[PDB]
Design a protein around this motif. Structure first.
Motif, short mmCIF file in Angstrom:
data_model
loop_
_atom_site.label_atom_id
_atom_site.label_comp_id
_atom_site.label_asym_id
_atom_site.label_seq_id
_atom_site.Cartn_x
_atom_site.Cartn_y
_atom_site.Cartn_z
N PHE A 47 -59.72 6.85 18.16
CA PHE A 47 -59.77 7.34 19.52
C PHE A 47 -59.00 8.10 20.55
O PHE A 47 -58.76 9.15 19.64
CB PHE A 47 -58.33 5.85 19.83
CG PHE A 47 -57.11 5.76 19.67
CD1 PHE A 47 -56.20 6.49 20.18
CD2 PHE A 47 -57.19 5.66 18.58
CE1 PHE A 47 -55.07 6.66 19.47
CE2 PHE A 47 -55.53 5.43 17.53
CZ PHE A 47 -54.83 6.47 18.10
N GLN A 48 -58.22 8.70 21.83
CA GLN A 48 -58.04 9.60 21.74
C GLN A 48 -56.89 9.67 21.65
O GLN A 48 -56.02 8.60 22.69
CB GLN A 48 -58.52 9.69 23.69
CG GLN A 48 -59.06 11.09 23.52
CD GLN A 48 -58.50 12.37 22.65
OE1 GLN A 48 -57.83 12.51 23.81
NE2 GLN A 48 -59.17 13.21 22.67
N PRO A 49 -55.93 10.19 20.64
CA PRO A 49 -54.42 9.90 20.30
C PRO A 49 -53.41 9.99 22.16
O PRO A 49 -54.05 10.93 22.59
CB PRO A 49 -54.10 11.06 19.71
CG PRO A 49 -55.63 11.84 19.17
CD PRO A 49 -56.13 11.31 19.47
N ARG A 50 -52.59 9.50 21.96
CA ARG A 50 -51.80 9.48 23.17
C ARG A 50 -50.63 10.35 22.79
O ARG A 50 -50.16 10.24 22.14
CB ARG A 50 -51.58 8.14 23.45
CG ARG A 50 -52.18 6.68 22.95
CD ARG A 50 -53.56 6.60 23.33
NE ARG A 50 -54.46 5.39 24.22
CZ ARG A 50 -53.85 4.47 24.80
NH1 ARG A 50 -52.99 5.23 26.13
NH2 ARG A 50 -54.83 3.31 24.41
N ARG A 69 -49.92 16.09 22.12
CA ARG A 69 -50.28 17.65 22.70
C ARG A 69 -51.31 18.12 21.86
O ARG A 69 -51.98 19.25 22.38
CB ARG A 69 -49.12 18.14 21.78
CG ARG A 69 -48.54 19.44 23.19
CD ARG A 69 -47.27 20.33 22.76
NE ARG A 69 -45.94 19.98 23.80
CZ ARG A 69 -46.07 20.31 25.12
NH1 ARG A 69 -47.22 20.85 25.55
NH2 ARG A 69 -45.33 20.20 26.20
N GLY A 70 -51.69 18.22 20.92
CA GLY A 70 -53.35 18.63 20.92
C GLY A 70 -52.75 19.90 19.98
O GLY A 70 -53.53 21.05 19.31
N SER A 73 -48.08 11.35 15.05
CA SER A 73 -49.37 10.84 13.75
C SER A 73 -49.59 9.91 13.89
O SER A 73 -50.54 9.60 13.03
CB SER A 73 -48.46 12.17 12.65
OG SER A 73 -48.37 13.41 12.80
N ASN A 74 -48.37 9.05 13.76
CA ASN A 74 -48.65 7.50 12.58
C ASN A 74 -49.24 6.60 14.19
O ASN A 74 -49.22 6.13 13.19
CB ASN A 74 -47.90 7.39 12.36
CG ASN A 74 -47.07 8.43 10.82
OD1 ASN A 74 -46.42 8.55 10.63
ND2 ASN A 74 -48.24 7.53 10.12
N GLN A 75 -49.26 6.84 14.85
CA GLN A 75 -49.79 6.34 15.85
C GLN A 75 -51.21 5.76 15.29
O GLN A 75 -52.61 5.98 14.59
CB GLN A 75 -50.37 6.82 17.24
CG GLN A 75 -51.11 8.18 17.63
CD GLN A 75 -52.14 8.16 19.16
OE1 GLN A 75 -52.20 7.71 19.24
NE2 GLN A 75 -50.70 9.30 18.77
#
Lengths: 252, 252
Positions: free
Chosen positions: B17-20, B171-172, B225-227
């Motif tokens: 998915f797209q990290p939040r 943040r990427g 990171s751990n999401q």
């Protein structure tokens, strides 16, 4: 009018010598230096007191919170709580700004409660917070007394107030180490801290506040109380995990 | 001139998915609120990071210290250390004032070292502090890089400087979470931090500084990171003791 002694816990320690003040002990043990500054075993005592109390309150079901530094109430400003969540119990360890008796910055752990309608709920919660305070102090081995502070004599923003003074042999007197007060709808009225009733009313909740640990004072009480004729000070069992020893012995 | 990448540790996490960003995660989990404010599992993460690092440094032989809040050096002002005590390793957890990226107050744990004569001693100590930082970060499961900061290009009060950037998927990009610098006799010259040699000389010692933990940044790195796709975030094993769980799951 004047403060009543509600309870007495522990005994005054007995010494074969003239008890020394916490500064002399700290300097002899190289745990107090300089302004002021804790080093080694003293620093472990500080962090261990904070952690013991914080963990104790976590095991009792207090939700932890952290703040970037009056405030505890302010973070519930313009907030409404459901009837089913009452009472709300919050524990916060934080750095506060104002001998080690009065330093500018120090760590304190605080208790905050928002409860259901009326004096019955708020008083139950205040007695619960007081009991936690006495439990912690008893488990630390300290000799202390619990006093009923007057509220309508001066003051006002408190329906009931309890203070705890721990015995300080070096000072030779009792000194305040915790406080707890039932502020009722004072804070909720001013900050709009609401609760929703079962019927669907929003009403001003009650707020209760308590100090769960003021470290500088507890440190003073422990050092003077547990001190030995060798200038050693014994470690209470509850803190021996964090200190790794049952007695501080000063360096070579 | 420009920063060189000295080391790479860990892998970028892979997502379906797209990290939040850490704010979205915290709000979905009710661990970030409001100004800003950590609640429940987030507060446990903060306190657990501080304690894990502090304990790690205590086991390595760092003497703890606490201060009432630049300062770490200042407490050694006008002090002389014996040759036999070198190097002196100090660990201090304290509240510092300056998204959770930039809050006014936050807790940081700092490393401070005073060492024997010359570049060889000071550099050995700086490499030791860097290694501790990388160890802690590796044990937390984070993906990070260690960079060599230029010192004679701008700057000056540092002979060598290492910064560590941890990967932030929301943040990427990489963001700084620790720093470490060899200030040599700068600080000792200005504050009169002396060491006594074997012959009986007093000479300006060397000072080394390192961040052992900046919590806001580490929090951001861990949450992003751990999401999980459920908005869950997994708990690193090193922190599962303080959190009591391997996964935060948001309230009902």
């Amino acid at each position: 009018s004047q403060a009543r002694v509600l309870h007495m816990v522990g005994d005054k320690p007995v010494f074969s010598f003239q008890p020394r003040g916490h500064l002399e002990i700290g300097e002899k043990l190289d745990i107090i230096r300089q302004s002021y500054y804790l080093r080694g075993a003293g620093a472990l005592l500080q962090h261990g007191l904070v952690n013991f109390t914080f963990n104790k309150l976590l095991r009792r079901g207090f939700t932890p919170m952290t703040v970037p530094d009056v405030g505890l109430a302010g973070y519930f400003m313009d907030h409404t709580v459901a009837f089913r969540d009452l009472p709300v119990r919050m524990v916060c360890s934080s750095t506060c700004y104002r001998g080690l008796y009065r330093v500018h910055h120090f760590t304190k752990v605080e208790m905050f409660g928002v409860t259901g309608p009326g004096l019955e709920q708020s008083s139950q919660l205040l007695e619960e917070f007081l009991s936690l305070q006495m439990e912690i102090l008893t488990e630390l081995g300290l000799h202390f007394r619990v006093l009923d502070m007057p509220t309508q004599e001066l003051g006002l923003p408190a329906y009931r107030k309890f203070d705890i003074e721990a015995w300080m042999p070096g000072r030779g007197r009792f000194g305040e180490v915790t406080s707890a007060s039932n502020c009722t709808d004072f804070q909720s009225r001013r900050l709009h801290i609401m609760f929703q009733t079962e019927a669907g009313e929003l009403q001003f909740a009650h707020t209760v506040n308590a100090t769960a640990c003021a470290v500088p004072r507890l440190l003073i009480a422990l050092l003077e109380s547990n001190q030995q004729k060798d200038g050693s000070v014994l470690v209470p069992p509850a803190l021996q995990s964090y200190l790794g020893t049952d007695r501080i012995t000063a360096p070579t």
